[PDB]
Write a protein that binds this ligand. Structure first.
Ligand code: GTP
Ligand code: GTP
Ligand code: GTP
Ligand code: SAM
Ligand code: SAM
Ligand code: MG
Ligand code: MG
Lengths: 1057, 49, 76, 76
């Protein structure tokens, strides 16, 4: 595909009309049409009108009489908005009538019409000698041979040349033209040689490699800069055309070398001609910015003037020393030869050199236009770093990067009202267990719960977390864009919670349009509003699970026992407006109207009852444990006595508290109480506060007391912390291979030459790094890159500091981002619940692993893409046994990581457990290597095999993660599981196929039968805070609702020898 | 006055660059003929929209 | 939960632009947008207009020439 | 007086957030002003402002005429 394939042709000659068409080239009878006769456009940003005539008229000089026409007055008439199409068409049409080119029509089919001379003579009003010649002998404008079209006028005038003014392409700007073209009387090539050689004796002139009408024409610029912009536009043209010829596609090119040849010019133009001739790889790569094209070309000529490549430098220099010569690739020259063959007497520039183009292997990345580049740094690469200097990141303005404390959660509106349940397990509550649990509860309450837990629970409030969604619903309702929704739908509730006004449907699934001029204020919500709403939805879901409508039944009532403003009472009253007879009242000791203000326990005189009760009582006063206990007990007592379906809050849900509550419901005469712990998606993500759900049932409740329940453990595992909470740093210095960075993120800016370097260095900590230049003219690249602990635990295993720096230097300068918009990174990004559970697993197992002495290696079977690497200490060897793992022998050798890349064999005879080894089986036991779920009996079997296989080894420790059966019982009754499911009774985490779960009792019994030492541990609250802190992650809402029940029901078996 | 503000914020002068782009002063200085030989030109006659 | 947990920082310094952005801190090419470039509001009870420029412009002294611009004539 | 009162509101709110223990992007640890020379009434404002009285957390004061509320509070 070397040879250029192009049909060269004189397009400018083709544009010249047959003489007969000149009478009607204006098309006087019919109006000009957009896109055919003209191309009007209005750049509202620049506020600049631009009319561009099409066809023969694109080349048109205007007599000053033509400018006096109203059509040219229009852009001044409309400074601000686009000229209306009616006025444009009407005025342009009348001016089109106004024009009439001189001609003599004739029968000969070979004839053309010298349109250039015709319009020019017209525009001068025939006062130039060319104008007289035309006005007296219009037939002279007709021509057969294109060149003799002018030779006739030259011989007729006795002049050696004419100097035509150039058209401005937009007809609205009247600004003085940069240059004019001078047509010469040079019929033979020799006359042209002479005119060129004389042309090198005089300033500011240049000419095309070949000329239209086959008549020599020279541009003469009024200033140096005008020449520079001209040359640059032509270099763009020839570069694009050569870019198409190089791809080998056929092109209708007007001439083989589209760019200009200086004949006399300043140094800067000679530079432009030289790099323009070079056809530098940098244009194909889009390395230059075209916004200020000529400048880019000057800098490029600079780099070439002292290029590292001797060939390119000597070639550029040679092109600069002899700028009058037209350098061209051999493939161009063969095209020129074909052209000389087709038209033997054609004129084309005689002084020309045929250089061989110099190949360059460096493929620069580029992408101009908006969009930050979201890098994924490699851990290692071909480049070998040695003692790299610290790379300071510059300060960056808020004009470019803001750092919001928390990421607002994107979520479907229904998901907010989800909740999870946790039913009691224990059949009895022995008194020794009471003394123990009370000891743990008093000791826990007396010294306040973890400071980091509080920092998170208060940094990530649910109200600001759900804010954009609610304000979005209000913003769509205000524009009238919202329309259809069910009367009882959760979307209806969100709508009632978004706006202060009463909503009323005009019919089924159709809300009333807003009255004109009425824009009701958004409904006021405190932090506990959405939560109370979700507890209401939970009550409706608990009375029956089948329901889709959430409206209360007629002649029924609800109470929201905790009350101040209690906005939820208002949103509920507004949600049920079409339902007859629905009492809804708050009733706090701090209650404002509508809500009645009254203390709990209720006064003996007052009569209170309801079919539903949503207590939210929480004394602000600091108090002794006995008083908090008796108060919570009396609260649940009156809540149960006053309603068939209480939904009481518990601020301090210790096992002792909840069990004492159950003992109290047991003590009440004649009414057995079914009960369940609960937590909504609308609760604050980190609150350990729990909603116990009371309801009478005719049967006595088997297994009524709690023990090691999820919702409780979310609280009790949290305790006073040994260390201060980890505040997210914003690093600006990127040390080479330091391992001294606290959790948080690098953020800042660097000069773009230094950009590839910094990416090569932040790769050590950051796993992925967004970057962007802010503008084409702004050299700095902004960089944001949060620190991944997994990347640290990987990269710092050995002292080698390799990276893909050679790849990153391909990026500069256009290849690493562009975005004018301010970007808003968060100190606490959103994550799916499964990922956070995985990080809690890794924190638990890592803290468990640091405690062990004298362990030679960590073997994570099913380790995928080194995902468990965060657990293993930098010393001990790491080993992966996942078939899915990709092989990287360089990374393996450089980072001390053996990788089996074969399926693990769970059969005991095939087992090969080394002494002093830590075998990780984190969620790998539940799946076959191809991904299909293994049946639960097979899972318990392979656990039994890993258990018996370890029985011989003197020192070993397995960590077999698995799912407990109880979770399926809980997710059958819960709602807040957007990710986790229960397809046909099996768990379905993420995108994995559903998998049957082991029962904990049979597994522990089996391990007792094996005789192996074992311990069924799960990650705690402090591990969660550790994960969220170290990773820079915030939990989110639905994740915070389901995390307790999910993480409590993913135990890690801890086999030990 | 408004267009005058928009024009004069650009500068009362400019210099053609070595790349040939215009570079306006950004300042509202009164012109003096001493500048006629200087790199600067009056901004009114730039013919830049 | 006794210890205060706060990241102190010079926000006013953070608001100061890199010098390159000063050429286009006005964003001359594109129109100012509500809620990003400015925050106009009209208290109909008080009948008081209130325009509040956003970003770097929140801190902005006005030359008496700037006050002579029609934009400041609007509330009247 | 109005300046000091606005700053006392600011520091009181910020301290209200720090007391809850939530992480805050506070510009400076003590948002309120220090008189260097001032009238008696400002010295009163600085004193109750420093006190971080329970009355602000309880919303006992009316903020509609904030400085006045603070003067009466300094009286009590
Ligand atoms: N006044 C006038 N000028 C013309 C006419 N035809 C061509 N020109 C000018 O002749 C110059 C060189 O002619 P061409 O080679 O055909 O045009 P070009 O150099 O390829 O560049 P473009 O005109 O932009 O397409 C251009 O700058 C045109 O402005 C015409 O009919 N009338
Ligand atoms: N062909 C070519 N020659 C150059 C270039 N830059 C410098 N020179 C040579 O250097 C001489 C003057 O050097 P300088 O005064 O440093 O060039 P400059 O105008 O300041 O341009 P810069 O190198 O970008 O600073 C000229 O006569 C040229 O021969 C270039 O980019 N291309
Ligand atoms: N620090 C402090 N001193 C006060 C206050 N009120 C009175 N004093 C003292 O009392 C002196 C003057 O007393 P008054 O004239 O009764 O005070 P006042 O200006 O009338 O203000 P009121 O007590 O509200 O009537 C001052 O010099 C103060 O030292 C107060 O509210 N705060
Ligand atoms: C955490 S607040 C939330 C209240 C309500 N959910 C709302 O919309 O704001 C709980 C309120 O219950 C009130 N309260 C405290 N003790 C109470 C009691 N013993 N009996 C009735 N209300 C009480 C307190 O004044 C407290 O403001
Ligand atoms: C839960 S994923 C990875 C475990 C852990 N969450 C992680 O990211 O490192 C389990 C992977 O182990 C692989 N796997 C499944 N069965 C295996 C087996 N019998 N032996 C080794 N690897 C297996 C599967 O390809 C699956 O992708
Ligand atoms: Mg052309
Ligand atoms: Mg301030």
């Amino acid at each position: 595909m070397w040879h250029y394939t192009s049909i060269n042709n004189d397009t400018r000659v083709a544009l010249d009309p047959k003489p007969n068409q000149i009478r009607t080239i204006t098309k006087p009878n019919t109006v000009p049409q957009l896109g055919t006769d003209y191309l009007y456009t209005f750049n509202s940003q620049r506020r600049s009108h631009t009319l561009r005539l099409l066809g023969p008229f694109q080349y048109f000089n205007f007599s000053e009489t033509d400018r006096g026409h109203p059509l040219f007055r229009l852009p001044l008439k409309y400074p601000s908005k686009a000229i209306p199409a009616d006025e444009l068409i009407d005025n342009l049409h009348s001016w089109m009538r106004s024009v009439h080119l001189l001609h003599v029509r004739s029968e000969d089919n070979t004839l053309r019409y010298n349109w250039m001379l015709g319009v020019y003579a017209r525009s001068t009003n025939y006062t130039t000698p060319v104008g007289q010649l035309v006005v007296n002998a219009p037939a002279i404008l007709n021509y057969s041979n294109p060149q003799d079209a002018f030779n006739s006028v030259f011989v007729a005038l006795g002049i050696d040349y004419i100097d035509i003014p150039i058209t401005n392409s937009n007809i609205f700007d009247d600004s003085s033209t940069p240059y004019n073209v001078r047509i010469w009387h040079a019929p033979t090539m020799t006359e042209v040689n002479h005119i060129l050689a004389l042309m090198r004796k005089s300033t500011l002139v240049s000419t095309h490699s070949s000329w239209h009408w086959n008549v020599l024409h020279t541009f003469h610029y009024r200033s140096e800069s005008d020449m520079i912009d001209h040359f640059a536009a032509k270099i763009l043209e020839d570069w694009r055309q050569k870019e198409k010829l190089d791809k080998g596609a056929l092109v209708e090119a007007d001439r083989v070398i589209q760019r200009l040849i200086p004949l006399s010019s300043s140094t800067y133009v000679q530079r432009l001609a030289a790099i323009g001739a070079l056809y530098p790889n940098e244009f194909t790569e889009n390395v230059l910015d075209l916004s200020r094209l000529s400048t880019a070309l000057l800098q490029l000529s600079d780099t070439y003037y002292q290029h590292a490549n001797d060939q390119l430098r000597r070639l550029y220099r040679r092109m600069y020393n002899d700028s009058r010569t037209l350098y061209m690739t051999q493939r161009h020259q063969e095209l020129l030869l074909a052209q000389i063959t087709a038209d033997p007497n054609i004129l084309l520039y005689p002084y020309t050199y045929i250089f061989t183009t110099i190949p360059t292997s460096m493929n620069y990345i580029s992408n101009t236009g908006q969009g930050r580049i979201k890098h994924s740094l490699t851990v290692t690469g071909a480049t070998e770093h040695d003692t790299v200097a610290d790379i300071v990141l510059g300060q960056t303005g808020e004009d470019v990067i803001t750092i919001s404390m928390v990421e607002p959660m994107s979520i479907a509106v229904e998901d907010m009202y989800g909740y999870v349940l946790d039913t009691p397990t224990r059949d009895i509550w022995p008194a020794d267990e009471q003394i123990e649990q009370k000891g743990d509860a008093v000791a826990l309450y007396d010294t306040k719960t973890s400071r980091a837990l509080g920092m998170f629970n208060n940094t990530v409030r649910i109200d600001d977390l759900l804010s954009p969604l609610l304000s979005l619903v209000y913003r769509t309702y205000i524009k009238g864009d919202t329309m259809t929704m069910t009367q009882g739908s959760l979307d209806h509730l969100t709508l009632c919670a978004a706006v202060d006004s009463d909503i009323t449907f005009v019919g089924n699934r159709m809300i009333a349009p807003l009255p004109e001029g009425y824009i009701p204020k958004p409904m006021h919500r405190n932090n506990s509003t959405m939560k109370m709403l979700s507890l209401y939805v939970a009550l409706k879901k608990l009375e029956n699970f089948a329901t889709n409508s959430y409206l209360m039944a007629p002649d029924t009532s609800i109470i929201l026992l905790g009350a101040e403003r209690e906005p939820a009472v208002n949103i509920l009253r507004r949600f049920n407006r079409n339902v007859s007879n629905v009492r809804i009242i708050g009733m706090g000791d701090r209650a404002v109207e509508p809500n009645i203000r009254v203390r709990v326990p209720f006064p003996i005189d007052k009569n209170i009852s309801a079919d539903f009760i949503i207590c939210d009582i929480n004394s602000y006063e600091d108090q002794s444990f006995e008083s908090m206990f008796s108060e919570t007990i009396s609260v649940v007592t009156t809540c149960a006595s006053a309603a068939t379906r209480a939904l009481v809050k518990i601020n301090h849900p210790s096992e002792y508290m909840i069990n004492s509550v159950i003992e109290r419901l047991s003590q009440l005469g004649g009414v057995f109480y079914h009960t369940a712990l609960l937590k909504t998606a609308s609760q604050n993500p980190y609150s350990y506060e729990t909603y116990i759900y009371i309801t009478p049932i005719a049967a006595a409740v088997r297994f009524p007391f709690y023990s090691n329940s999820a919702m409780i453990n979310r609280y009790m595992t949290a305790v006073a912390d040994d260390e201060m909470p980890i505040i997210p740093s914003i690093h600006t210095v990127i040390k080479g291979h330091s391992n001294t960075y606290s959790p948080g993120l690098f953020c800042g800016c660097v000069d773009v030459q230094s950009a590839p370097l910094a990416l090569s260095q932040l790769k050590s900590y950051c796993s992925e790094a967004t970057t962007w230049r802010v503008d084409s003219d702004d050299n700095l690249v902004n960089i944001i890159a949060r620190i991944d602990p997994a990347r640290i635990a990987l990269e710092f295993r050995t002292r080698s500091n390799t990276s893909a720096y050679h790849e990153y230097q391909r990026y500069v300068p256009n290849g690493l981002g562009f975005k004018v918009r301010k970007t808003r990174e968060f100190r606490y990004m959103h994550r799916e619940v499964t990922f956070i559970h995985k990080l809690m697993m890794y924190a638990l197992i890592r803290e468990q692993i640091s405690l062990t002495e004298n362990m030679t290696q960590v073997v994570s079977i099913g380790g995928r893409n080194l995902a468990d690497i965060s657990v293993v200490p930098l010393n001990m060897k790491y080993v992966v046994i996942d078939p899915a793992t990709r092989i990287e022998t360089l990374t393996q050798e450089k980072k001390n990581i053996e990788v089996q890349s074969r399926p693990f064999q769970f059969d005991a005879a095939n087992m090969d457990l080394e002494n002093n080894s830590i075998y990780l089986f984190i969620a790998v036991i539940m799946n076959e290597p191809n991904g299909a779920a293994t049946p639960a009996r097979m899972q318990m079997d392979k656990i039994r095999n890993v258990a018996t296989a370890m029985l011989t080894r003197t020192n070993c420790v397995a960590y077999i993660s698995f799912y407990e059966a109880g979770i399926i019982t809980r997710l059958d009754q819960s709602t807040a599981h957007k990710t986790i499911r229960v397809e046909e009774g099996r768990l379905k985490v993420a995108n994995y196929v559903p998998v049957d779960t082991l029962v904990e009792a049979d597994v522990t019994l089996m391990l007792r039968d094996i005789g192996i030492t074992h311990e069924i541990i799960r990650p705690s609250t402090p591990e969660l805070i550790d994960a969220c802190s170290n990773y820079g992650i915030r939990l989110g809402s639905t994740g915070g609702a389901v995390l307790d029940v999910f993480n409590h029901y993913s135990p890690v078996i801890k086999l030990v020898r | 006055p408004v267009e005058y503000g928009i024009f004069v914020q650009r500068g009362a002068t400019y210099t053609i660059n070595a790349a040939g782009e215009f570079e306006f002063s950004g300042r509202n200085e009164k012109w003096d003929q001493a500048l006629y030989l200087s790199e600067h030109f009056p901004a009114l006659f730039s013919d830049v929209p």
